[PDB]
Protein backbone atom coordinates (compact mmCIF):
# COMPACT_ATOMS: atom_id res chain seq x y z
CA UNK A 1 0.00 0.00 0.00
CA UNK A 2 1.65 3.20 1.28
CA UNK A 3 3.05 2.45 4.72
CA UNK A 4 4.55 -0.78 3.38
CA UNK A 5 6.51 1.11 0.73
CA UNK A 6 7.73 3.81 3.12
CA UNK A 7 8.85 1.24 5.69
CA UNK A 8 10.60 -0.98 3.15
CA UNK A 9 12.53 2.02 1.83
CA UNK A 10 13.57 2.86 5.37
CA UNK A 11 14.67 -0.67 6.22
CA UNK A 12 16.65 -1.19 3.01
CA UNK A 13 18.50 2.11 3.22
CA UNK A 14 19.22 1.58 6.92
CA UNK A 15 20.72 -1.87 6.36
CA UNK A 16 22.90 -0.43 3.58
CA UNK A 17 23.94 2.43 5.86
CA UNK A 18 25.05 -0.05 8.51
CA UNK A 19 26.98 -2.25 6.07
CA UNK A 20 28.86 0.82 4.84
CA UNK A 21 29.33 2.12 8.39
CA UNK A 22 31.24 -1.06 9.19
CA UNK A 23 33.07 -1.66 5.87
CA UNK A 24 34.27 1.92 5.24
CA UNK A 25 35.60 2.75 8.69
CA UNK A 26 38.97 4.30 7.83
CA UNK A 27 37.80 6.63 5.05
CA UNK A 28 35.31 8.26 7.36
CA UNK A 29 31.64 7.55 6.74
CA UNK A 30 29.29 10.41 7.53
CA UNK A 31 26.10 9.48 5.76
CA UNK A 32 24.38 8.22 2.64
CA UNK A 33 21.70 9.19 0.14
CA UNK A 34 19.86 6.92 -2.31
CA UNK A 35 17.92 8.52 -5.17
CA UNK A 36 15.46 6.57 -7.31
CA UNK A 37 15.12 7.37 -11.01
CA UNK A 38 14.29 5.62 -14.30
CA UNK A 39 17.90 6.03 -15.49
CA UNK A 40 18.94 3.73 -12.64
CA UNK A 41 19.44 4.22 -8.91
CA UNK A 42 22.00 6.78 -7.76
CA UNK A 43 23.75 6.30 -4.43
CA UNK A 44 25.82 9.13 -2.95
CA UNK A 45 28.35 8.40 -0.20
CA UNK A 46 29.54 11.15 2.13
CA UNK A 47 33.04 10.91 3.57
CA UNK A 48 36.19 12.86 4.36
CA UNK A 49 38.80 11.00 2.29
CA UNK A 50 37.11 9.86 -0.95
CA UNK A 51 40.37 8.30 -2.15
CA UNK A 52 40.04 5.28 0.13
CA UNK A 53 36.52 4.73 -1.22
CA UNK A 54 37.72 5.19 -4.80
CA UNK A 55 40.47 2.59 -4.69
CA UNK A 56 42.83 4.13 -7.31
CA UNK A 57 43.58 0.67 -8.80
CA UNK A 58 39.90 -0.14 -8.68
CA UNK A 59 38.93 -3.23 -6.71
CA UNK A 60 36.70 -1.04 -4.51
CA UNK A 61 34.28 0.94 -6.68
CA UNK A 62 33.25 -2.25 -8.49
CA UNK A 63 33.24 -4.37 -5.34
CA UNK A 64 30.75 -1.81 -4.04
CA UNK A 65 28.31 -1.60 -6.94
CA UNK A 66 28.40 -5.37 -7.50
CA UNK A 67 27.75 -6.28 -3.87
CA UNK A 68 24.84 -3.83 -3.93
CA UNK A 69 23.52 -5.94 -6.82
CA UNK A 70 24.39 -9.39 -5.47
CA UNK A 71 22.89 -8.92 -2.01
CA UNK A 72 20.64 -5.87 -1.58
CA UNK A 73 19.36 -5.82 -5.16
CA UNK A 74 19.47 -2.19 -6.24
CA UNK A 75 18.14 -1.39 -9.71
CA UNK A 76 21.24 -1.30 -11.96
CA UNK A 77 22.72 1.48 -9.80
CA UNK A 78 25.81 3.62 -9.65
CA UNK A 79 27.49 5.69 -6.97
CA UNK A 80 28.72 9.22 -6.39
CA UNK A 81 31.35 10.05 -3.77
CA UNK A 82 30.94 13.48 -2.20
CA UNK A 83 33.07 15.04 0.55
CA UNK A 84 32.32 16.80 3.83
CA UNK A 85 33.75 20.26 4.40
CA UNK A 86 33.98 21.28 8.04
CA UNK A 87 33.57 17.68 9.27
CA UNK A 88 34.54 18.82 12.79
CA UNK A 89 30.84 19.38 13.52
CA UNK A 90 29.58 15.88 12.67
CA UNK A 91 29.91 13.76 15.78
CA UNK A 92 30.04 10.25 14.32
CA UNK A 93 33.24 10.86 12.36
CA UNK A 94 34.77 12.41 15.48
CA UNK A 95 33.78 9.46 17.65
CA UNK A 96 35.29 7.00 15.18
CA UNK A 97 38.44 9.13 15.02
CA UNK A 98 38.77 9.10 18.81
CA UNK A 99 38.26 5.34 18.90
CA UNK A 100 40.92 4.79 16.23
CA UNK A 101 43.28 6.92 18.32
CA UNK A 102 42.57 4.91 21.48
CA UNK A 103 43.30 1.76 19.48
CA UNK A 104 46.58 3.25 18.25
CA UNK A 105 47.62 3.87 21.85
CA UNK A 106 47.07 7.52 22.70
CA UNK A 107 46.14 8.39 26.27
CA UNK A 108 42.43 9.07 26.57
CA UNK A 109 42.80 12.47 28.25
CA UNK A 110 45.32 13.60 25.63
CA UNK A 111 43.10 12.54 22.74
CA UNK A 112 39.92 13.92 24.31
CA UNK A 113 41.41 17.37 24.89
CA UNK A 114 42.87 17.32 21.37
CA UNK A 115 39.45 16.61 19.87
CA UNK A 116 37.73 19.19 22.08
CA UNK A 117 40.08 22.00 21.08
CA UNK A 118 39.91 20.98 17.41
CA UNK A 119 36.12 21.18 17.61
CA UNK A 120 36.34 24.55 19.37
CA UNK A 121 38.73 26.15 16.87
CA UNK A 122 36.28 25.52 14.01
CA UNK A 123 32.96 26.74 15.38
CA UNK A 124 30.97 25.22 18.22
CA UNK A 125 29.05 26.69 21.14
CA UNK A 126 29.29 23.49 23.17
CA UNK A 127 30.71 19.99 23.13
CA UNK A 128 30.48 17.03 25.51
CA UNK A 129 32.55 13.85 25.35
CA UNK A 130 32.12 10.72 27.47
CA UNK A 131 34.25 7.60 27.74
CA UNK A 132 33.41 4.37 29.52
CA UNK A 133 35.29 1.16 30.19
CA UNK A 134 38.45 -0.35 31.64
CA UNK A 135 40.38 2.89 31.30
CA UNK A 136 42.48 2.46 34.47
CA UNK A 137 42.88 -1.18 35.47
CA UNK A 138 40.21 -3.85 35.74
CA UNK A 139 37.46 -1.97 37.57
CA UNK A 140 35.65 -0.06 34.85
CA UNK A 141 34.74 3.60 35.13
CA UNK A 142 33.23 6.49 33.18
CA UNK A 143 34.84 9.85 32.44
CA UNK A 144 33.36 13.09 31.15
CA UNK A 145 34.72 16.21 29.45
CA UNK A 146 32.68 19.26 28.48
CA UNK A 147 32.80 22.84 27.25
CA UNK A 148 30.24 25.50 26.45
CA UNK A 149 26.44 25.19 26.27
CA UNK A 150 24.20 22.14 26.00
CA UNK A 151 20.53 21.23 25.69
CA UNK A 152 20.36 17.75 27.20
CA UNK A 153 16.58 17.50 27.61
CA UNK A 154 13.63 19.00 25.73
CA UNK A 155 12.94 19.30 22.01
CA UNK A 156 16.17 21.16 21.18
CA UNK A 157 18.11 18.16 22.51
CA UNK A 158 16.68 16.25 19.55
CA UNK A 159 16.58 18.93 16.89
CA UNK A 160 19.75 21.04 17.43
CA UNK A 161 22.48 18.83 18.88
CA UNK A 162 24.48 16.27 16.90
CA UNK A 163 25.24 13.00 18.70
CA UNK A 164 27.50 10.08 17.91
CA UNK A 165 28.57 6.82 19.51
CA UNK A 166 31.35 4.36 18.79
CA UNK A 167 33.30 1.43 20.20
CA UNK A 168 37.03 0.83 20.60
CA UNK A 169 38.31 -2.74 20.82
CA UNK A 170 41.57 -2.91 22.75
CA UNK A 171 43.93 -5.63 23.96
CA UNK A 172 41.58 -6.20 26.91
CA UNK A 173 38.04 -5.23 25.97
CA UNK A 174 35.63 -2.58 24.72
CA UNK A 175 35.48 1.16 25.39
CA UNK A 176 32.43 3.29 24.63
CA UNK A 177 32.80 6.79 23.18
CA UNK A 178 29.92 9.28 23.13
CA UNK A 179 30.17 12.72 21.51
CA UNK A 180 27.62 15.55 21.44
CA UNK A 181 28.06 18.86 19.62
CA UNK A 182 26.07 22.10 19.46
CA UNK A 183 26.59 23.95 16.15
CA UNK A 184 27.00 27.74 16.03
CA UNK A 185 23.67 28.54 14.36
CA UNK A 186 21.68 27.07 17.28
CA UNK A 187 19.27 29.44 19.02
CA UNK A 188 17.17 28.61 22.05
CA UNK A 189 13.66 29.85 22.86
CA UNK A 190 14.96 31.89 25.81
CA UNK A 191 17.64 33.77 23.82
CA UNK A 192 15.74 36.84 22.66
CA UNK A 193 17.25 40.11 21.44
CA UNK A 194 15.69 43.56 21.60
CA UNK A 195 15.35 45.72 18.49
Amino acid sequence: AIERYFIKEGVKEMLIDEFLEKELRRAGYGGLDIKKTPLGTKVTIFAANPGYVIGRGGRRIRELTRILEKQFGLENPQIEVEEIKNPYLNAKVQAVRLAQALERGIHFRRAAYSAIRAIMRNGARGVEIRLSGKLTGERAKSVRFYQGYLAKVGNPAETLVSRGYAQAQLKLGVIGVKVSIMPPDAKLPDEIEIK
Binding site: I2, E3, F6, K35, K36
Partner: protein, 100 residues
Protein backbone atom coordinates in the same frame (compact mmCIF):
# COMPACT_ATOMS: atom_id res chain seq x y z
CA UNK B 1 -11.63 14.52 -19.51
CA UNK B 2 -10.27 14.86 -15.97
CA UNK B 3 -7.14 13.77 -14.14
CA UNK B 4 -6.86 13.05 -10.42
CA UNK B 5 -3.57 13.36 -8.53
CA UNK B 6 -2.98 11.74 -5.13
CA UNK B 7 -0.11 12.88 -2.91
CA UNK B 8 1.23 11.27 0.27
CA UNK B 9 4.17 12.23 2.45
CA UNK B 10 5.69 12.41 5.92
CA UNK B 11 6.46 16.11 5.31
CA UNK B 12 3.95 18.92 4.90
CA UNK B 13 6.36 21.29 3.16
CA UNK B 14 6.89 19.09 0.09
CA UNK B 15 3.12 18.69 -0.23
CA UNK B 16 2.60 22.45 -0.03
CA UNK B 17 5.34 22.91 -2.62
CA UNK B 18 3.74 20.58 -5.15
CA UNK B 19 0.28 22.01 -4.49
CA UNK B 20 1.43 25.59 -5.05
CA UNK B 21 3.33 24.60 -8.19
CA UNK B 22 0.45 22.83 -9.92
CA UNK B 23 -2.05 25.43 -8.71
CA UNK B 24 0.01 28.22 -10.26
CA UNK B 25 0.68 26.32 -13.50
CA UNK B 26 -3.06 25.72 -13.82
CA UNK B 27 -3.95 29.32 -12.97
CA UNK B 28 -1.52 31.03 -15.35
CA UNK B 29 -3.22 28.92 -18.02
CA UNK B 30 -6.97 28.62 -18.44
CA UNK B 31 -8.04 25.47 -16.60
CA UNK B 32 -10.66 24.94 -13.90
CA UNK B 33 -9.06 23.08 -10.99
CA UNK B 34 -10.18 21.20 -7.89
CA UNK B 35 -8.78 21.19 -4.38
CA UNK B 36 -6.50 20.97 -2.65
CA UNK B 37 -8.46 18.31 -0.74
CA UNK B 38 -7.16 16.97 2.60
CA UNK B 39 -7.80 13.34 3.42
CA UNK B 40 -7.43 12.04 6.98
CA UNK B 41 -3.94 11.43 8.29
CA UNK B 42 -2.64 7.88 8.63
CA UNK B 43 -0.84 7.12 11.90
CA UNK B 44 1.23 3.98 12.40
CA UNK B 45 1.70 3.43 16.13
CA UNK B 46 3.95 0.87 17.81
CA UNK B 47 4.12 0.36 21.57
CA UNK B 48 7.04 -1.79 22.74
CA UNK B 49 8.84 -2.54 26.01
CA UNK B 50 12.08 -0.73 26.83
CA UNK B 51 13.97 -3.28 28.91
CA UNK B 52 15.80 -6.00 26.96
CA UNK B 53 15.35 -8.27 29.99
CA UNK B 54 12.44 -9.11 32.27
CA UNK B 55 13.41 -7.57 35.59
CA UNK B 56 12.16 -4.11 36.43
CA UNK B 57 8.80 -2.40 36.29
CA UNK B 58 7.20 -2.21 32.84
CA UNK B 59 7.81 1.10 31.05
CA UNK B 60 6.52 1.24 27.49
CA UNK B 61 7.76 3.11 24.42
CA UNK B 62 5.17 4.51 21.99
CA UNK B 63 6.45 5.41 18.53
CA UNK B 64 4.31 7.07 15.88
CA UNK B 65 4.61 7.72 12.14
CA UNK B 66 2.17 10.28 10.74
CA UNK B 67 1.46 10.40 7.00
CA UNK B 68 -0.39 13.31 5.40
CA UNK B 69 -2.44 12.93 2.21
CA UNK B 70 -3.80 15.31 -0.43
CA UNK B 71 -6.04 14.98 -3.47
CA UNK B 72 -6.52 17.10 -6.59
CA UNK B 73 -8.44 17.06 -9.88
CA UNK B 74 -7.06 19.16 -12.72
CA UNK B 75 -9.33 18.62 -15.78
CA UNK B 76 -6.48 17.36 -18.02
CA UNK B 77 -6.54 20.00 -20.74
CA UNK B 78 -4.37 19.99 -23.87
CA UNK B 79 -1.03 21.19 -22.48
CA UNK B 80 -1.88 20.97 -18.77
CA UNK B 81 -0.98 17.28 -18.54
CA UNK B 82 2.34 17.62 -20.36
CA UNK B 83 3.29 20.75 -18.40
CA UNK B 84 2.34 19.15 -15.06
CA UNK B 85 4.21 15.89 -15.65
CA UNK B 86 7.26 18.18 -16.01
CA UNK B 87 7.51 18.81 -12.27
CA UNK B 88 10.51 18.54 -9.94
CA UNK B 89 9.13 16.44 -7.09
CA UNK B 90 11.21 15.58 -4.00
CA UNK B 91 11.85 11.91 -3.32
CA UNK B 92 10.08 11.96 0.07
CA UNK B 93 6.67 12.37 -1.61
CA UNK B 94 4.56 9.72 -3.34
CA UNK B 95 2.61 11.16 -6.29
CA UNK B 96 0.23 9.23 -8.53
CA UNK B 97 -2.11 10.32 -11.32
CA UNK B 98 -5.22 8.65 -12.75
CA UNK B 99 -7.30 9.62 -15.79
CA UNK B 100 -11.08 9.47 -15.41
Amino acid sequence: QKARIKLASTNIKALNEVTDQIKQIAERTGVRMSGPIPLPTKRIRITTRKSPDGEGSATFDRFELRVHKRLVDIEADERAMRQIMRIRVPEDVTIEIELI
